[PDB]
Write a protein that binds this ligand. Structure first.
Ligand code: CLA
Ligand code: CLA
Ligand code: CLA
Ligand code: CLA
Ligand SMILES: CCCCCCCCCCCC(=O)OC\C(C#C[C@@]12O[C@]1(C)C[C@@H](O)CC2(C)C)=C/C=C/C(C)=C/C=C/C=C(C)/C=C/C=C(\C)C=C=C1C(C)(C)C[C@H](OC(C)=O)C[C@@]1(C)O
Ligand SMILES: CC(=O)O[C@H]1CC(C)(C)C(=C=C/C(C)=C/C=C/C(C)=C/C=C/C=C(C)/C=C/C=C(\C)C(=O)C[C@@]23O[C@]2(C)C[C@@H](O)CC3(C)C)[C@](C)(O)C1
Ligand SMILES: CC(=O)O[C@H]1CC(C)(C)C(=C=C/C(C)=C/C=C/C(C)=C/C=C/C=C(C)/C=C/C=C(\C)C(=O)C[C@@]23O[C@]2(C)C[C@@H](O)CC3(C)C)[C@](C)(O)C1
Ligand SMILES: CC(=O)O[C@H]1CC(C)(C)C(=C=C/C(C)=C/C=C/C(C)=C/C=C/C=C(C)/C=C/C=C(\C)C(=O)C[C@@]23O[C@]2(C)C[C@@H](O)CC3(C)C)[C@](C)(O)C1
Ligand code: KC2
Ligand code: KC2
Ligand SMILES: CC1=C(C#C/C(C)=C/C=C/C(C)=C/C=C/C=C(C)/C=C/C=C(C)/C=C/[C@@]23O[C@]2(C)C[C@@H](O)CC3(C)C)C(C)(C)C[C@H](O)C1
Lengths: 222, 228, 193, 179, 201
C-alpha cells in the first residue's frame, strides 16, 4: 500500500488522531525494498503483533485464574497458583518447542508464494492483503479446517463488514499490545501500571526467556 | 447439488430449524474429495450412528432389565443382576471379538463394490444412496436372508413413504444417540442427566476400550470341544 | 543455463530455485550436474540412514545371529551410535566391498552424468557389460520393476518427492547423530539416540 | 492382474487386492508377485504336510538318521521345532544347500526368466518325473493350477498357524497348547 | 435492509416518546438513540421484555407475600420425597420460596422460559406468521402462535397460544392495540422500578 493508503487507513481507524507516524518507519526503506513493500511489512507486523497480543491478553487472564484443561498431564504437572508468566516456565521445554514450531509451520504456510497465489492473494510485501492467512488447500495431506474461520462463519461477509472488521482488528490490536504489556510490566515491576497495584501477581523471571534452560547454552531433551 | 439435497432433507427433518451446519462440515473438503462425496460420507455417518444408537438403546433396556436367551451361550457367564455396562464386560473375550468381527463383515459388505454393484448401486461417496446396506447377492455361498427387511415386508412401498422413513430414521437416530450417551454419561459424571439420577449405576471402567476387562476365557462349546 | 530445467524446485520456497549463495548461477552446467548427482546420492544415503537409525533406536533387530557368536540384538543393545564397532570386521568389510563395487561400476558406465548423462540416474544394471565378470541381472533400482506402471508425468512427480524426501532425510540423520552427541541439541529425541 | 489366474469364485470372481499392490505392479512386477506366491505356496504345502504327518502319529522313517552320532528318526521327537533342533547341523546344511542349488537352477535354467517374459513358477526338473500330468487338456491344466494356488494359500496360512502356536502358546484354537 | 415502519431513527423514537408520555418526551442522556436500526429494535424489544418480566415478577411477589399458596403437592409421585406448596410458602419470602424450590423444578421452569424465548426469536416462525425478527424490522414483543397447523407446527397439536389464549383482546380497535402497547410500556417501567424496590427492601 502507498503512504496515501496508510493515511486513509489511519483516518478511518481514528479520524481525530489520523496518520501518526512520528518515527517515519513508513518512510524508511526496509532492506532497500520500495515504500509500498515496507508499508506492507509494517502493516503485517502491526496486525500480527495485535493478534498475538489479543490472544496473549486472554491467555494471561486464563492462566492467572488457573482455568486449565481437565484431561492433560502437563497442566496437572504444572503447580497451581503460579503467576501466569511462571505457568509458561513450569512446562516441559518440549511443549514450548512445539508451540513455537507450530507457529513456525503456520507462518511458513502464510508467506508461501504458491499457496497465496493459488488461493488468489499475494504476499503482503508484494501488494497482497496484509493480515491474510491462506487456507490449507495445497497442503501435502488433507486437514479438516483452516486457521481463519475453521468453521464457516464470515464465508458470506460483505466487503464493507470486512473493512470494518480489519479496522477494528488494528485498533483492538493496538490496545491489546498495551494491555498485555501492562500485565507483564505490573507483574515484573510492581507499581508500574498504577491501576493494577495488588491485582497482577508479581514475578521475578524474564518473560522474554521462553525456555528455562538456555537453548543456546544447555537445552533439555525428551 | 448435494448440499441442496441435504438442505431440503434438513427441512423435511425439521422445517422450523432447517439446515443447521454450525461447523460447515458439508462445505469442508474431507480427504480432498468434492462436496458431493463429503456430504455422502457425512450423511452415511449420521444414519450409521443413529441406527447403532437406536439398537444400543433397545439393547440397554434389554440387558439392564434382564432379557437373556436360554441355554448354552455367552449369557451363562454374565452374572445375574449385572449392569448394562457389565454385560459386555462379562461375556467371553471370544464373544466380544466375534460380535465386533461380524459387525466388521457387515460393514465390509456394506462398502464393498461387489455387493453394491450386484444390487445396481454405487458407494455412498460416489453417487449412491447414503445408508444403503446391499443384499447378499455376491457372498460366494448364498445367504438365506438379507440384512435390511429380511422378510421383504417393504417389497412394495411407495418412494414417498421410503423418503419419509429415511427422514424419520435420521431424527430418531439423533434422539437415540442423545439418549444412549445420556445413559453412558450418568454413570461416569453423576448429576449430568437429571432424570437418570439414581437409576443408572456408576461404572468404573473405560467404555471406549472394547476389550477391557477382556472378560472370561471360558469354553462354552460342549460336543466336539477338541479346542480345550 | 541447465539450472532452469532441472527438478527440485518445490512449493515451499515459492516455486523458485533455492540458492541464497548463488553458486548455481556462478558455476557452470557441468558442476551443476555434479551437484545434482551428489545431492541425490547424499539424499538417498540419508533416506537409508535415517530409517536405519530409527530401527536401531527402537532396538528392532532381525531374529538370528550376525556372526556365529554375536546376536543382532547384542550388536544393537548399545543404541545405533555404538553399533558399527560391534558389527564384526568381516561383515562391514563385505558391506563396504559391495559398496565399492557399486560405486566403481556406476562411475565406470560410459554416459557419465557430467560428460553427457542424466544426473542421479545411475545405471540400473551395474556389473553388466564388464569383461570377465558375471553377476545376476538384479536391477539395482526397482528389481521388481514398479517403474513400468508409471508414466513420465508420474515419474517426474515421484522424482520431486525423491528430492524433497532426500533433503528431509539428510536433515534428519544429522539430527539423530547430533542428538546423540549433544544431548539437548535436537528436542523430540529421547535418550535412545 | 485381471488376466492372471487365481480369481476363483471365492472372492467374487475378481482379484483380491485391498492395498492395491497389483495397481503398482507392472507386468513383470506381477510376474514376480505370482512367482513369489507360487514358491510360498509350494514350500508351505510341503511344510504343512510334513508337520501334520510327523506330529499326527505317522510312521517315522526307520533306522538311524545319523549312525555316526547316534541320532535316530525315533530319537527326534515328533514335535515341531524339536526334531529340527535335534537334527544334525550337517543334515540341516544338506537340506539348505540342495534347496539353494535347486533355486539357483530354477533362476538360471529357465530361459525366458519369469521376470523377462516366461511363465512364473515353472521348474521343469522337479515337476512330474513320471509324467503324471503330461496328457491333460489345457483347460484342465489351468483348473489344476488354480487348485494349486488355492491349496497353497491355505497351506501358507496353516504353516504360520503351526509356527505361531509354538512361539505363542494357545494362539490357534483346535491345536495343542504346546506346539 | 429494513423493510417496515418500525422505529429506526431518533425521530421515530421521539414520536413514540411523546406518544407514551407528552411530558417527558425522549430522555436519552446516554444517546442510545444515535444507533443503527437493528440496535434500536433490540433496545425496544429489551425494554418490552423487561416490562413483561417485571410485571409478572411484581404480581407474583404480591401473591406470594399475601400467602395464597397452591393446594397441590409439588413432588412425590414418581417415587420421590413429598413436598407441598404450603411447605414452599412456609420456607419464607419470595426469594426464599425460590431457594426452597427443588433443583429440577427450577431447571424445568427455566427450560420452559427458554422455550418461549426461542419460539419468539425463531425468524421462520414469525415469517410463517406475520412478522420478522425485531432486529430486522419486526414488531418488538410479538410472540408467535404456539397452536398451528402449518408445516411449522409441533408434532403433537398444542391447545392454545401464550398470548391471547381465548381472545380477551378479541377485536380491540386497530389503534387501541397501540394504545394498549403505550399503556403496557408505561406500566412495565413502573413495575420495573417497583420490583427492584421490593427486592432492595
Ligand atoms: C550436500 C548436499 C546438497 C547438494 C549437493 C545440493 C545441490 C543442489 N541443491 Mg540443494 N539442498 C540440500 C542439500 C544439497 N543440495 C538440502 C539439505 C536442502 C534442504 C534445505 C536443499 C534444498 C534445495 C532446494 C529447495 C533447491 C536446491 C537446489 C540445489 C541445486 C542448486 C544449488 C547448488 O549449486 O548447490 C550446490 C550445493 C553445495 C555446494 C553443497 C553445500 C555445501 C556447504 C559447505 C554446506 C553448508 C553447511 C550446512 C548448512 C543443486 C543441485 C535447487 C534446485 O533443485 O534447482 C533446480 C533448489 O531449488 N537444494
Ligand atoms: C595374481 C593376481 C592376478 C591375476 C592372476 C590377474 C589376471 C588377470 N587380470 Mg588382473 N588384476 C589384479 C590381479 C591379478 N590379475 C589386481 C590385484 C587388480 C587390481 C584390482 C587387477 C585388475 C585388473 C583389471 C582391471 C583387468 C585385469 C585383467 C586381467 C586378465 C588379463 C587377461 C585376460 O583378459 O584374460 C582373458 C579374460 C578372462 C579369462 C576373464 C577374467 C578372469 C578372471 C575373473 C580375472 C587376467 C585374467 C583384465 C581383464 O580382461 O580382466 C577380465 C582387466 O581388464 N586385472
Ligand atoms: C506372500 C504370499 C502371497 C503373495 C506373494 C501373493 C500374491 C498375489 N496374490 Mg495373494 N494371497 C495370499 C498370499 C500371497 N499372495 C494368501 C495367504 C491368500 C489367502 C488369504 C491370498 C489370497 C489371494 C486371492 C484371493 C487372490 C490373490 C491374488 C494375488 C495376486 C494379486 C495381489 C497382489 O498384488 O498381492 C501382492 C502380495 C504381496 C506383495 C505380499 C503381501 C505382504 C504383506 C506385508 C503381508 C501381510 C500379511 C499379514 C502378515 C498376515 C498376487 C500374485 C489375486 C490373483 O491371483 O488375481 C489374479 C487373487 O485373486 N491372493
Ligand atoms: C519343507 C518341508 C519339510 C521339512 C522342513 C521337514 C523336516 C523334517 N522332516 Mg520331514 N516330511 C515332509 C516335509 C518336510 N520335512 C513331508 C512332506 C513329509 C510327508 C511325506 C515328511 C515326513 C517326515 C517323516 C515321516 C519324518 C520326517 C522327519 C523330518 C526331520 C528330518 C529330515 C527328513 O528326513 O526330512 C524328510 C523329508 C522328506 C523326505 C520330504 C521333503 C519334501 C520334498 C518336497 C520332497 C525334519 C524335522 C523325521 C523326524 O525327525 O520326524 C520326527 C521323520 O521321521 N519328515
Ligand atoms: C522385502 C520387500 C521389499 C519392498 C520394496 C519397497 C522399497 O524398499 O521401496 C523403496 C522405495 C520405493 C518405492 C516405489 O517403488 C514403489 C514401491 C512403487 C512406485 O509407485 C513408487 C516408487 C517410489 C518407485 C522408497 C523408499 C524410501 C525410503 C526408504 C525413505 C526414507 C525416508 C526417511 C526419512 C525422510 C527420514 C526422515 C527423518 C526425519 C524427518 C528426522 C527428524 C526429526 C524428528 C526426530 C522427527 C523430530 C525433530 O523435531 C524436533 C527436533 O522438534 C525434527 C527432526 C528433523 O530432527
Ligand atoms: C493504568 C491505567 O491508568 O490504565 C490502564 C492500563 C491497562 C494495562 C492498559 C489496562 C487495561 C486493559 C486493556 C486496555 C485491555 C485491552 C485488551 C484488548 C484490546 C483485548 C482484545 C482482544 C480481542 C480479541 C481476542 C478478539 C477476537 C476476535 C475474533 C477472533 C473474531 O471472531 C473477530 C470477528 O471478525 C470476525 C472474524 C467475524 C465477525 O463476525 C466479527 C468478529 C468480531 C466475531 C487497565 C487495567 O484497564 C488500566
Ligand atoms: C442353545 C441352547 O442351548 O438352546 C436351548 C434353549 C432353547 C433355545 C430355549 C430351547 C428351546 C425351545 C424351543 C426351541 C422351542 C420350540 C418350540 C416349537 C418349535 C413349538 C412349535 C409349536 C407349533 C405348533 C403347536 C403348531 C401348530 C400348527 C398347526 C395347527 C398346523 O400344523 C396347521 C397347518 O400346518 C398344517 C398341518 C398344514 C396345512 O394343512 C394347514 C396349516 C398350515 C394351517 C432348547 C430346545 O432347550 C435349546
Ligand atoms: C479351527 C481353527 O481355529 O483353525 C483351523 C484352521 C487353521 C488354523 C488354518 C488350521 C490349519 C491348517 C491348514 C488349513 C492347512 C492346510 C494345508 C494344505 C491346504 C495342504 C495341502 C497340501 C498339498 C499337497 C502336498 C499336494 C500335493 C500334490 C501332488 C503330489 C500332485 O501333484 C497331485 C497330482 O499330480 C497328481 C498325483 C496327478 C496329476 O494328474 C494331477 C495333480 C498335479 C493334481 C487348523 C490348525 O487346522 C485349524
Ligand atoms: C488471535 C488472533 C486474531 C484476533 C484476536 C483477531 C481479532 C479480530 C478482531 C478484533 C476485535 C476483529 C474485528 C477481526 C476482524 C477480522 N479478522 Mg481477525 N483476529 C485474529 C486472527 C485473524 C486471522 C488469522 C485472520 C483474521 C482475519 C480477519 C478479517 C477478515 C478480513 C477479510 O477477509 O477481508 C476480519 C474482518 C482474516 C484476514 O484476512 O484478515 C485481513 C485472517 O486471515 N484474523 N479480527
Ligand atoms: C534333500 C536333501 C538331501 C539330499 C538330496 C541328500 C542326498 C544324499 C546323497 C546323495 C545321493 C547321499 C549319498 C547322502 C548320504 C548321507 N546323508 Mg543326505 N541328503 C539330504 C538330506 C540329508 C539330511 C537331512 C541328513 C543327511 C544325512 C546323510 C548321511 C549321514 C551321515 C552320518 O551318519 O554322519 C549320509 C551318509 C544325515 C547326516 O549327514 O547326518 C550327520 C542327515 O541328517 N542327508 N545324502
Ligand atoms: C438370519 C439373518 C442373519 C443372521 C444372523 C446371525 C446372528 C447368525 C449367526 C451365526 C452363527 C453364530 C453361526 C455359527 C456357526 C458355527 C459353526 C459353523 C461351527 C462349526 C464347528 C465345527 C465344524 C467344528 C468341528 C469339530 O469339533 C468337531 C465338532 C469335532 C471333530 O469331528 C471336528 C472338529 C474338531 C473340527 C443375517 C444374514 C446377518 C441378516 C438377515 O437379515 C437375517
Amino acid at each position: 500500500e502507498t503512504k496515501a493508503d496508510l493515511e486513509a487507513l489511519a483516518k478511518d481507524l481514528n479520524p481525530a488522531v489520523g496518520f501518526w507516524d512520528p518515527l517515519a518507519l513508513s518512510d524508511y526503506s526496509f532492506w532497500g525494498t520500495s515504500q509500498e513493500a515496507t508499508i506492507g511489512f509494517l502493516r503485517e507486523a502491526e496486525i500480527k503483533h495485535g493478534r498475538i497480543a489479543m490472544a496473549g491478553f486472554v491467555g494471561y487472564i486464563v492462566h492467572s485464574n488457573d482455568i486449565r484443561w481437565t484431561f492433560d498431564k502437563v497442566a496437572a504437572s504444572v503447580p497451581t497458583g503460579l503467576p501466569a508468566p511462571a505457568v509458561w516456565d513450569a512446562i516441559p521445554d518440549i511443549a514450548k518447542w512445539q508451540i513455537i514450531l507450530f507457529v513456525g509451520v503456520m507462518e511458513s504456510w502464510r508467506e508461501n508464494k504458491v499457496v497465496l497465489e493459488a488461493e488468489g492473494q499475494k504476499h503482503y510485501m508484494s501488494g497482497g492483503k496484509p493480515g491474510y492467512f491462506p487456507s490449507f488447500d495445497l497442503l501435502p495431506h488433507p486437514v479438516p479446517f483452516p486457521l481463519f474461520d475453521p468453521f464457516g462463519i464470515s464465508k458470506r461477509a460483505t466487503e464493507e463488514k470486512k473493512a470494518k472488521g480489519r479496522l477494528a482488528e488494528i485498533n483492538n490490536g493496538r490496545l491489546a499490545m498495551i494491555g498485555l504489556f501492562g500485565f507483564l510490566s505490573e507483574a515484573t515491576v510492581p507499581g508500574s501500571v498504577p491501576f493494577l497495584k495488588g491485582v497482577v501477581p508479581a514475578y521475578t523471571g524474564e518473560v522474554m526467556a521462553p525456555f528455562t534452560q538456555n537453548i543456546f547454552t544447555a537445552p533439555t531433551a525428551l | 447439488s448435494a448440499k441442496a439435497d441435504l438442505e431440503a432433507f434438513a427441512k423435511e427433518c425439521n422445517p422450523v430449524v432447517g439446515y443447521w451446519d454450525p461447523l460447515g462440515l458439508a462445505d469442508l473438503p474431507l480427504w480432498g474429495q468434492d462436496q458431493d462425496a463429503v456430504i455422502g460420507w457425512l450423511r452415511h455417518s449420521e444414519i450409521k450412528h443413529g441406527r447403532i444408537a437406536m439398537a444400543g438403546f433397545v439393547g440397554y433396556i434389554a440387558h439392564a432389565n434382564g432379557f437373556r436367551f436360554g441355554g448354552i451361550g455367552p449369557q451363562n457367564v454374565v452374572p445375574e443382576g449385572a449392569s448394562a455396562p457389565e454385560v459386555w464386560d462379562s461375556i467371553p473375550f471370544l464373544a466380544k471379538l466375534q460380535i465386533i468381527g461380524a459387525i466388521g463383515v457387515l460393514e465390509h459388505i456394506s462398502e464393498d463394490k461387489n455387493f453394491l454393484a450386484a444390487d445396481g448401486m454405487k458407494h455412498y461417496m460416489r453417487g449412491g444412496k447414503p445408508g444403503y446396506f446391499p443384499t447378499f447377492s455376491a457372498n460366494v455361498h448364498p445367504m438365506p436372508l438379507n440384512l435390511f427387511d429380511p422378510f421383504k415386508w417393504s417389497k412394495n412401498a411407495s418412494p414417498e413413504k421410503k423418503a419419509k422413513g429415511l427422514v424419520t430414521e435420521t431424527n430418531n437416530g439423533r434422539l437415540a444417540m442423545l439418549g444412549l450417551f445420556g445413559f453412558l454419561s450418568e454413570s461416569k459424571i453423576p448429576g449430568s442427566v437429571p432424570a437418570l439420577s439414581g437409576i443408572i449405576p456408576s461404572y468404573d471402567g473405560d467404555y471406549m476400550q472394547p476389550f477391557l476387562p477382556t472378560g472370561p476365557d471360558t469354553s462354552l462349546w460342549t460336543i466336539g470341544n477338541l479346542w480345550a | 543455463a541447465l539450472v532452469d530445467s532441472m527438478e527440485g524446485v518445490g512449493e515451499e520456497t515459492g516455486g523458485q530455485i533455492w540458492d541464497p549463495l548463488g553458486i548455481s548461477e556462478a558455476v557452470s552446467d557441468e558442476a551443476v550436474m555434479w551437484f545434482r548427482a551428489s545431492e541425490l546420492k547424499h539424499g538417498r544415503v540419508a533416506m537409508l540412514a535415517s530409517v536405519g537409525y530409527l530401527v536401531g533406536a527402537a532396538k528392532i533387530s532381525f531374529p538370528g545371529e550376525l556372526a556365529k557368536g554375536v546376536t543382532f540384538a547384542s550388536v544393537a543393545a548399545n543404541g545405533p551410535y555404538q553399533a558399527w564397532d560391534a558389527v564384526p570386521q568381516a561383515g562391514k568389510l563385505q558391506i563396504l566391498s559391495i559398496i565399492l563395487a557399486l560405486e566403481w561400476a556406476t562411475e565406470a558406465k560410459k554416459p557419465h552424468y557430467m560428460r553427457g548423462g542424466v544426473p542421479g540416474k545411475i545405471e540400473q544394471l551395474p556389473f553388466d557389460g564388464i569383461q570377465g565378470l558375471w553377476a545376476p541381472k538384479i536391477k539395482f533400482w526397482d528389481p521388481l520393476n514398479f517403474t513400468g506402471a508409471l508414466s513420465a508425468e508420474q515419474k517426474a512427480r515421484k522424482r520431486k518427492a525423491e528430492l524433497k524426501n532426500g533433503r528431509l532425510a539428510m536433515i534428519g540423520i544429522i539430527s539423530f547423530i547430533t542428538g546423540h552427541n549433544l544431548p539437548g541439541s535436537v528436542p523430540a529425541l529421547d535418550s535412545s539416540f | 492382474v485381471s488376466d492372471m489366474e487365481g480369481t476363483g469364485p471365492e472372492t467374487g470372481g475378481k482379484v483380491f487386492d485391498p492395498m492395491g499392490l497389483s495397481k503398482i505392479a507392472s507386468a513383470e512386477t506381477l510376474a514376480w508377485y505370482r512367482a513369489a506366491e507360487l514358491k510360498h505356496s509350494r514350500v508351505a504345502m510341503a511344510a504343512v504336510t510334513g508337520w501334520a504327518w510327523v506330529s499326527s502319529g505317522g510312521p517315522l522313517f526307520p533306522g538311524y538318521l545319523s549312525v555316526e552320532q547316534g541320532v535316530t528318526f525315533e530319537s527326534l521327537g515328533r514335535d515341531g521345532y524339536a526334531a529340527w533342533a535335534a537334527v544334525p547341523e550337517a543334515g540341516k546344511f544338506q537340506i539348505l544347500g540342495v534347496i539353494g542349488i535347486l533355486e539357483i537352477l530354477s533362476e538360471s535354467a529357465v530361459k525366458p526368466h519369469y521376470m523377462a517374459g516366461g511363465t512364473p513358477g515353472k521348474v521343469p526338473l522337479l515337476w512330474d518325473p513320471l509324467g503324471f500330468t503330461a496328457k491333460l487338456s489345457p483347460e484342465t491344466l489351468a483348473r489344476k493350477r488354480l487348485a494349486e494356488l488355492k491349496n497353497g494359500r491355505l497351506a501358507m496360512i496353516g504353516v504360520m498357524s503351526l509356527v505361531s502356536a509354538h512361539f505363542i502358546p494357545n494362539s490357534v484354537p483346535l491345536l495343542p497348547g504346546s506346539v | 435492509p429494513w423493510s417496515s415502519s418500525e422505529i429506526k431513527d431518533k425521530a421515530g423514537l421521539e414520536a413514540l416518546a411523546k406518544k407514551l408520555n407528552p411530558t417527558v418526551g425522549l430522555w436519552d442522556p446516554l444517546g442510545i438513540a444515535e444507533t443503527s436500526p437493528e440496535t434500536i429494535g433490540w433496545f425496544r424489544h429489551a425494554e418490552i421484555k423487561h416490562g413483561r418480566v417485571a410485571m409478572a415478577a411484581f404480581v407474583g411477589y404480591c401473591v406470594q407475600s399475601n400467602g395464597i399458596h397452591f393446594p397441590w403437592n409439588i413432588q412425590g409421585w414418581q417415587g420421590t420425597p413429598v413436598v407441598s406448596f404450603a411447605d414452599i410458602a412456609a420456607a419464607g419470602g419470595p426469594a426464599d420460596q425460590w431457594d426452597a424450590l427443588s433443583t429440577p423444578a427450577k431447571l424445568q421452569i427455566l427450560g420452559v422460559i427458554g422455550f418461549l424465548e426461542m419460539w419468539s426469536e425463531t425468524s421462520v416462525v414469525l415469517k410463517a406468521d406475520g412478522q420478522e425478527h425485531y432486529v430486522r424490522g419486526g414488531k418488538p414483543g410479538y410472540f408467535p402462535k404456539l397452536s398451528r397447523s402449518d408445516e411449522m407446527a409441533f408434532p403433537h397439536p398444542v391447545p392454545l397460544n401464550l398470548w391471547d389464549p381465548f381472545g380477551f383482546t378479541s377485536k380491540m380497535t386497530p389503534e387501541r392495540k397501540e394504545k394498549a402497547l403505550l399503556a403496557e410500556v408505561n406500566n412495565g417501567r413502573l413495575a420495573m422500578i417497583g420490583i427492584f424496590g421490593m427486592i432492595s427492601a
